């Protein structure tokens, strides 16, 4: 198909207009004072949201060149949200700031390559300052605080997350589900999560998360082999009755067992799943007995001399719910006895003094973390057909952001951290003047999040920004209460990874656009 082709300022004005439409719609939702955006649906009542992620998702423009501008910033803000677990709106706001001032610099006749070079220096320096400024979120109050803020200032979800981490630990397994109720609840059960992918993708019963979930299934294991389904027939029958879906994990299902198994999944008479299996050769024998011990099942191998034919209905392990993702598979609430599981822990704990290398004490300790750790499950319990599918996606991210806080720490929220970092970078310089202007472009942008938050309050960004800059450390503006004070004490905490990611992705796309001389698309 013949193409529409634009060059230079022509290309860039259209990108900028498209960026402007995207960012102007998204930025109004930033901070506790965010305005509402009405989003139309094909039929029925419109959706009304303060959520920048939902707003960005709907933006697409008629003009193709403008549209490319918007999709560029979207993709990049979307990557920040997936890496850090939050920051989409912040990343979008920053991107518009850098792009706008950057293109003014290009239009004045300044070297774009130098402009981009100075922006990058500023960002690399800004990222180090953030790492310096950061402080640990080690503590229940703080974790709850950060959770609450990633939760859109919802205490309950912040309380839940900090509650989960208390029981299962900071790096412990935590999963998000629906459940039945108008309110959200938390449960801590026996289960584990190891990295195994689906053997075939078509197992997936839920395309949204691209994962498989079976309800009250059975678990199978190897060992051997599995070359042929002929020995998979007898155990498939008994599982057919009782209406309980079957799960087969290990090990290395191949041939028609790998193939003819995936056929019956597409047809509605069967529900089955398979996984990439344990970390073997030798260690799989350890991992499997761990799974079997958790699921209350038995491990039947040909090595020992046992056959898959003799395997009975009770020979299988069991769990309440199972989830198999692309790279991962999780077991929720195994039915294995606690006396069994507990003794299996001690058996592995002896091997710690029995370990002749640092490499073994890692693995075996990773196993005791799976069995002894358990799995904390939170049920969103937002009651609606539409409200459920959504709130599960935000809490899933709110959990990701808290994890990010626990890893790389936290900094003063409300755009204060970026304001502070920019003040420290006041002396930073480039190789030439154009690189210098680039640097100042980045440093000006770092004020945009605070300014926008304030503007959404109906107060004057100039005055508040000035007042905050005139202060020190974690002093900031609390946009909920309209008062200044210590941001950390006030509990307004950004995960450092989130602030960091927002700026980096923002600056990425902005460098790209500032360095863009040509666009190609389809004819109108």
Ligand X SMILES: Nc1ncnc2c1ncn2[C@@H]1O[C@H](COP(=O)(O)OP(=O)(O)O)[C@@H](O)[C@H]1O
Annotated binding site for Ca(2+): 459
> What six digits make up the tokens of 410?
């936290």
The contact mask relative to Ca ion for 485-514 (x = CB under 5 A, - = no) is ------------------------------
Phi, psi of 423 (to 5 degrees): -70, -35
When asked if residue 86 is in the footprint of Mg ion (CB under 5 A), the reply is yes
Picked from K ion, ligand X, Ca ion, none, the partner binding residue 69 (CB below 5 to 8 A depending on kind) is none
Least distance from Ca ion to the Cβ atom of residue 517, Å: 7
Of residues 107-126, those binding Ca ion (CB under 5 A): 112
Number of residues that bind Ca ion (CB under 5 A): 1
The candidate with the shortest Cα–Cα distance to 518, out of 44, 6, 80, is 6
When asked if residue 176 is in the footprint of a copy of itself (CB under 8 A), the reply is no
Pairing of β 173-177 and β 375-379:
parallel
When asked if residue 436 is in the footprint of a copy of itself (CB under 8 A), the reply is no
When asked if residue 289 is in the footprint of K ion (CB under 5 A), the reply is no
| Alpha carbon distance 502, 88 (integer Å) | 7
| Alpha carbon distance 149, 367 (integer Å) | 33
- The alpha carbon of residue 89 and the mean position of all alpha carbons in its chain are separated, in whole angstroms, by 15
The contact mask relative to K ion for 22-51 (x = CB under 5 A, - = no) is -------x----x---------------x-
215: Cβ contacts below 8 Å, ≥ 6 apart? 245, 320, 321
Least distance from Ca ion to the Cβ atom of residue 459, Å: 5
When asked if residue 192 is in the footprint of a copy of itself (CB under 8 A), the reply is no
Picked from a copy of itself, Mg ion, Ca ion, none, the partner binding residue 38 (CB below 5 to 8 A depending on kind) is a copy of itself
Which residues are near ligand X by CB under 6 A?
29-32, 34, 52, 86-90, 149, 153, 413-415, 449, 453, 478-480, 492, 494
Alpha-carbon distances of 106 from 91, 110, 270, 316, rounded to whole Å? 22, 5, 61, 67
Least distance from ligand X to the Cβ atom of residue 86, Å: 5
Decide if 376 contacts 174 (C-beta within 8 A): yes
Tell me the window of 221-229, 327-335, 442-450, 463-471 that interacts with a copy of itself (CB under 8 A).
221-229
> What six digits make up the tokens of 396?
């899933």
Decide if 241 contacts 235 (C-beta within 8 A): no
Least distance from ligand X to the Cβ atom of residue 474, Å: 12
The contact mask relative to a copy of itself for 260-299 (x = CB under 8 A, - = no) is --------xx------------------------------
Q: Can you give the three-state secondary structure of 424-470, one letter per residue?
A: HCCCCCCCCHHHHHHHHHHHHHCCHHHHHHHHCCCCCHHHHHHHHHC
| Burial class (CB within 10 angstroms; exposed 0-12, middle 13-18, buried 19+) of 483 | exposed
Q: Which residue is nearest to Ca ion (CB)?
A: 112
301: Cβ contacts below 8 Å, ≥ 6 apart? 222, 223, 224
- Give me the residues that bind a copy of itself (CB under 8 A), please: 1-3, 5, 7, 11, 15, 21, 24-25, 28, 33, 35-40, 42, 44-46, 48, 55, 58-62, 64, 67-68, 71-72, 74-75, 111-114, 225, 227-228, 240-244, 254-259, 268-269, 457-458, 512-513, 515-523
List of residues contacting K ion (CB under 5 A): 29, 34, 50
């Amino acid at each position: 198909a013949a193409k529409d082709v634009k060059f230079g300022n022509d290309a860039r004005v259209k990108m900028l207009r498209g960026v402007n439409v995207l960012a102007d719609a998204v930025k109004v939702t930033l901070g506790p004072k965010g305005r509402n955006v009405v989003l139309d649906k094909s039929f029925g009542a419109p959706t009304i949201t303060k959520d920048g992620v939902s707003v960005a998702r709907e933006i697409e423009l008629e003009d193709k060149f403008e549209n490319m501008g918007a999709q560029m910033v979207k993709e990049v803000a979307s990557k920040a949200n997936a890496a850090a677990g939050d920051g989409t709106t912040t990343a979008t706001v920053l991107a518009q700031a850098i792009i706008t001032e950057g293109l003014k610099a290009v239009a004045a006749g300044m070297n774009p390559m130098d402009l981009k070079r100075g922006i990058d220096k500023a960002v690399t320096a800004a990222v180090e300052e953030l790492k310096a400024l950061s402080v640990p979120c080690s503590d229940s109050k703080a974790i709850a605080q950060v959770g609450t803020i990633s939760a859109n200032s919802d205490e309950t979800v912040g309380k839940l997350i900090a509650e989960a981490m208390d029981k299962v630990g900071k790096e412990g397994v935590i999963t998000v589900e629906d459940g039945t109720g108008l309110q959200d609840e938390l449960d801590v059960v026996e289960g584990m999560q190891f990295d195994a992918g689906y053997l075939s993708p078509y197992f997936i019963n839920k395309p949204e998360t691209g994962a498989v979930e079976l309800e009250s299934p059975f678990i199978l294991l190897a060992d051997k082999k599995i070359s042929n389904i002929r020995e998979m027939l007898p155990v498939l029958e008994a599982v057919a009755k009782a209406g309980k879906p079957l799960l087969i994990i290990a090990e290395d299902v191949e041939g028609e067992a790998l193939a003819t198994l995936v056929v019956n999944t597409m047809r509605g008479i069967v529900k089955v799943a398979a996984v990439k299996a344990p970390g073997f050769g030798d260690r799989r024998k350890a991992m499997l007995q761990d799974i079997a011990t958790l699921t209350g099942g038995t491990v039947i191998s040909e090595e020992i001399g046992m056959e898959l034919e003799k395997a009975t209905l009770e020979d299988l392990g069991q769990a309440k719910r199972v989830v198999i993702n692309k790279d991962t598979t999780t077991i929720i609430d195994g039915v294995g006895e606690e006396a069994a599981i507990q003794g299996r822990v001690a058996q592995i704990r002896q091997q710690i003094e029995e370990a002749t290398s640092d490499y073994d004490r890692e693995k075996l300790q990773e196993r005791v973390a799976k069995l002894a750790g358990g799995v904390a499950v939170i049920k969103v319990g937002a009651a609606t057909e539409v409200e459920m599918k959504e709130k599960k996606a935000r809490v899933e991210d709110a959990l990701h952001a808290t994890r990010a806080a626990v890893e790389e720490g936290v900094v003063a929220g409300g755009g204060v951290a970026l304001i502070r970092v920019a003040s420290k970078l006041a002396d930073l310089r480039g190789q030439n003047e154009d690189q210098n202007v680039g640097i100042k472009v980045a440093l000006r942008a770092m004020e945009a999040p605070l300014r926008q938050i304030v503007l959404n309050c109906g107060e004057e960004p100039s005055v508040v920004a000035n007042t905050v800059k005139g202060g020190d450390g974690n002093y900031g503006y609390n946009a909920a209460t309209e008062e200044y004070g210590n941001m950390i004490d006030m509990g307004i905490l950004d995960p450092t990874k989130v602030t960091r990611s927002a700026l980096q992705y923002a600056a990425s796309v902005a460098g790209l656009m500032i360095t863009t001389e040509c666009m190609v698309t389809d004819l109108p």
